[PDB]
Amino acid sequence: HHHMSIEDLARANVRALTPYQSKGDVWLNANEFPTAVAFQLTEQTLNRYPEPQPKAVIESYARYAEVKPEQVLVSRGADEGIELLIRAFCEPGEDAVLYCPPTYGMYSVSAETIGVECRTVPTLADWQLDLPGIEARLDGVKVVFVCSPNNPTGQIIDPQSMRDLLEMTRGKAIVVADEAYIEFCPQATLAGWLSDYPHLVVLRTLSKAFALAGLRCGFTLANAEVINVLLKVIAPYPLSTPVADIAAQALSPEGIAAMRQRVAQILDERRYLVEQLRGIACVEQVFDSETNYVLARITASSAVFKSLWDQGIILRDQNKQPSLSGCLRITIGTRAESQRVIDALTAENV
Amino acid sequence: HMSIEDLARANVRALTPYQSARRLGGKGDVWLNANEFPTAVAFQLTEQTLNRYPEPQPKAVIESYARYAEVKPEQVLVSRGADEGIELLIRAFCEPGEDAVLYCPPTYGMYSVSAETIGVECRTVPTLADWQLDLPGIEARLDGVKVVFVCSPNNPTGQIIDPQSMRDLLEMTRGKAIVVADEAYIEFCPQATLAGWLSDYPHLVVLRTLSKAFALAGLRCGFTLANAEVINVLLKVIAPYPLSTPVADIAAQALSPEGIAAMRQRVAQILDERRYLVEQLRGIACVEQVFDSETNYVLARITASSAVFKSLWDQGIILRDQNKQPSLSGCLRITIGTRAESQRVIDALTAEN
Numbered sequence: 087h088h089h090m091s092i093e094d095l096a097r098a099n100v101r102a103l104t105p106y107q108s109k110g111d112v113w114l115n116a117n118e119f120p121t122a123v124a125f126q127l128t129e130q131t132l133n134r135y136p137e138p139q140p141k142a143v144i145e146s147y148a149r150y151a152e153v154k155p156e157q158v159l160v161s162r163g164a165d166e167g168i169e170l171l172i173r174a175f176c177e178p179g180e181d182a183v184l185y186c187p188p189t190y191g192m193y194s195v196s197a198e199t200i201g202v203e204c205r206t207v208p209t210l211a212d213w214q215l216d217l218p219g220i221e222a223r224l225d226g227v228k229v230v231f232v233c234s235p236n237n238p239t240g241q242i243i244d245p246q247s248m249r250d251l252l253e254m255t256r257g258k259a260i261v262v263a264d265e266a267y268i269e270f271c272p273q274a275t276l277a278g279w280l281s282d283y284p285h286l287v288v289l290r291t292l293s294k295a296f297a298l299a300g301l302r303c304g305f306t307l308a309n310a311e312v313i314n315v316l317l318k319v320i321a322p323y324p325l326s327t328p329v330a331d332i333a334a335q336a337l338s339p340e341g342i343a344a345m346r347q348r349v350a351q352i353l354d355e356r357r358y359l360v361e362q363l364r365g366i367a368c369v370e371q372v373f374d375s376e377t378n379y380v381l382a383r384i385t386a387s388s389a390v391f392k393s394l395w396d397q398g399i400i401l402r403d404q405n406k407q408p409s410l411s412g413c414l415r416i417t418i419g420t421r422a423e424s425q426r427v428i429d430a431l432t433a434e435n436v
Numbered sequence: 437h438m439s440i441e442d443l444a445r446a447n448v449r450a451l452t453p454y455q456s457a458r459r460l461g462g463k464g465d466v467w468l469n470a471n472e473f474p475t476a477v478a479f480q481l482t483e484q485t486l487n488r489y490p491e492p493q494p495k496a497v498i499e500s501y502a503r504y505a506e507v508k509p510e511q512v513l514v515s516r517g518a519d520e521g522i523e524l525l526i527r528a529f530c531e532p533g534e535d536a537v538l539y540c541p542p543t544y545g546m547y548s549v550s551a552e553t554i555g556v557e558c559r560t561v562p563t564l565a566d567w568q569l570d571l572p573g574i575e576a577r578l579d580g581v582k583v584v585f586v587c588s589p590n591n592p593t594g595q596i597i598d599p600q601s602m603r604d605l606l607e608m609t610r611g612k613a614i615v616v617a618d619e620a621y622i623e624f625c626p627q628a629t630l631a632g633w634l635s636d637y638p639h640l641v642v643l644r645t646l647s648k649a650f651a652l653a654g655l656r657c658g659f660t661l662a663n664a665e666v667i668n669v670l671l672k673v674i675a676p677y678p679l680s681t682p683v684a685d686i687a688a689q690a691l692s693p694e695g696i697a698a699m700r701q702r703v704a705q706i707l708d709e710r711r712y713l714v715e716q717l718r719g720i721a722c723v724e725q726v727f728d729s730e731t732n733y734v735l736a737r738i739t740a741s742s743a744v745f746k747s748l749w750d751q752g753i754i755l756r757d758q759n760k761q762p763s764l765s766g767c768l769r770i771t772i773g774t775r776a777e778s779q780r781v782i783d784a785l786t787a788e789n
């Protein structure tokens with residue numbers, strides 16, 4: 087047989103893909119909670135392997151989410167949850183994933199990296215689901231991802247449309263509700279629907295309202311039968327002991343109350359930032375959000391984005407996303423950080 | 437109308453969730469079954485930035501590990517253990533259903549587990565009677581192989597793979613496959629590392645871990661050393677944020693010059709304890725043979741090993757059974773622990789009389 091270079095020994099999809107890629111003082115670009123919550127290690131056992139699925143973390147998250155412990159898996163962020171679902175259910179080259187742009191980019195990245203076709207069905211003008219469009223495109227789909235509330239547009243997906251989607255996929259595909267932002271609108275969660283839908287899965291994270299993006303700790307909620315499949319494909323030791331230690335501390339009753347106050351702070355600050363933005367000459371529209379970010383369409387958005395960037399105010403450009411021409415996504419930070427944004431947009435004179 | 441398990445990939449249905457038989461601490465079990473350093477080294481966090489995403493590849497960890505390993509920073513990737521290094525290599529280079537991995541039993545099980553989970557053929561080439569490589573056997577089985585894993589020193593048998601045989605294997609695979617030297621245990625015999633060979637073999641990769649001599653299994657922190665071309669392929673398939681900030685913080689602490697010196701002292705402790713345990717083991721009626729090792733474990737063939745394993749297990753002394761491994765019938769793998777743990781093992785084996 088003939089020899090190949092390192093780059094040609096790599097899988098064809100790996101050679102072709104573009105991987106996800108990531109200076110100033112105001113960072114409002116990644117939906118992080120704006121201030122650190124300090125935690126110290128309480129378990130000096132680092133010479134020993136951790137538990138594969140740390141019981142205190144699983145049980146505390148299950149109590150918080152009001153599900154059974156056997157309905158909970160813990161992983162390296164909701165990002166790993168996405169990977170596990172495609173790894174378990176999608177035969178590379180034969181099965182597809184489906185998602186609905188404009189939305190979170192890692193469904194596509196994980197699928198393309200694993201070797202699984204992406205089906206895309208743009209949402210409607212209000213970013214609600216195109217159920218007929220999904221129906222037409224479901225052949226060969228094994229996993230459907232729906233972000234609700236959606237990143238980057240901010241709105242909750244209509245609950246009955248999710249039931250309609252779940253009936254459309256019953257016996258055919260897993261439906262994944264990505265609830266990375268559900269702490270900001272907790273009454274909207276679908277985690278209470280597991281008994282109706284054997285194929286429903288919910289992703290959760292500590293990265294956002296819980297203010298622990300640095301831990302890389304996320305959860306998959308599903309019926310036990312789905313959890314048991316995902317535990318067949320997960321790494322033996324996916325959570326380090328320091329992360330398990332801090333996660334358990336964060337998920338105590340005291341930790342939960344603290345998170346709920348973090349959410350209240352963000353909701354109050356979002357109300358302030360939205361009202362201020364709507365008065366700024368370069369802001370064309372601010373879209374209502376149920377999260378810790380708001381999408382704003384801005385006149386000359388690329389010049390404004392670069393202008394704030396050069397001033398050290400780092401937003402998230404969404405101008406290339408389907409339907410989002412002119413839109414920047416602004417995370418809700420501190421009042422001082424909101425005021426930096428307000429003052430810089432006001433100074434843009436466009 | 438398919439049930440949940442029927443929607444899963446066919447290969448996934450036959451997998452088994454990872455089974456840890458390990459009870460809580462506080463039952464007093466003696467854990468000599470996972471090649472862990474036997475006592476904790478304490479670290480505290482120094483960086484309270486947990487609201488922010490970590491660095492994708494923490495610079496201080498990468499550059500510290502590169503200094504330690506005497507390679508360039510562009511030749512280093514950090515992952516969730518060497519386990520994730522194994523996964524990335526198969527994920528980058530093995531097309532499921534088309535390409536194969538190759539390894540040489542009896543050896544570490546996760547090469548097979550990762551390949552079977554991803555859906556990549558496992559090609560096996562059992563080693564020779566002394567557990568050295570069967571190079572003719574490998575050459576006959578290399579068609580379609582994209583990644584070869586060789587554990588040196590080997591787990592569970594403990595010996596270093598002959599360096600000339602690794603050069604021969606590298607020439608055999610040039611242009612055809614990646615060769616991965618799994619160096620999880622290389623700190624116990626650091627002169628045997630192949631990390632200095634990168635400039636001679638574009639397709640050589642070395643896996644390292646903090647889980648063993650570095651006494652930081654709980655961190656889930658490992659490293660892949662390779663030429664930059666290989667690192668850059670692997671970085672296309674790694675998760676965007678694979679290392680948490682607490683792990684990066686502690687890892688950088690552990691890889692300081694003082695941390696390296698402390699690790700060397702841990703190795704010296706294990707080497708001295710291994711000499712004691714081996715000498716005592718060879719004097720015990722039920723021990724048939726103890727195989728020389730260059731690691732923090734020894735493989736011992738034991739008369740009625742299954743009954744002895746169960747006897748010690750029921751006493752709370754936890755070894756690693758290897759009786760079902762090719763060529764290893766009768767063999768238990770015994771991690772080197774503290775002196776008092778060695779003495780628990782010695783005393784229990786002596787009482788099997």
Ligand SMILES: Cc1ncc(COP(=O)(O)O)c(C=O)c1O
Binds near residue numbers: 166264303
């Ligand atoms: C919609 C959504 N899901 C998941 C994630 C990833 O979450 P994690 O930090 O738990 O990996 C993000 C990160 O920004 C996100 O926006």
Ligand SMILES: Cc1ncc(COP(=O)(O)O)c(C=O)c1O
Binds near residue numbers: 470471591644653
């Ligand atoms: C040969 C070998 N390689 C790799 C590993 C996994 O190491 P890590 O803890 O870095 O994932 C082990 C663990 O025992 C091992 O024995």
Ligand SMILES: [Cl-]
């Ligand atoms: Cl189309």
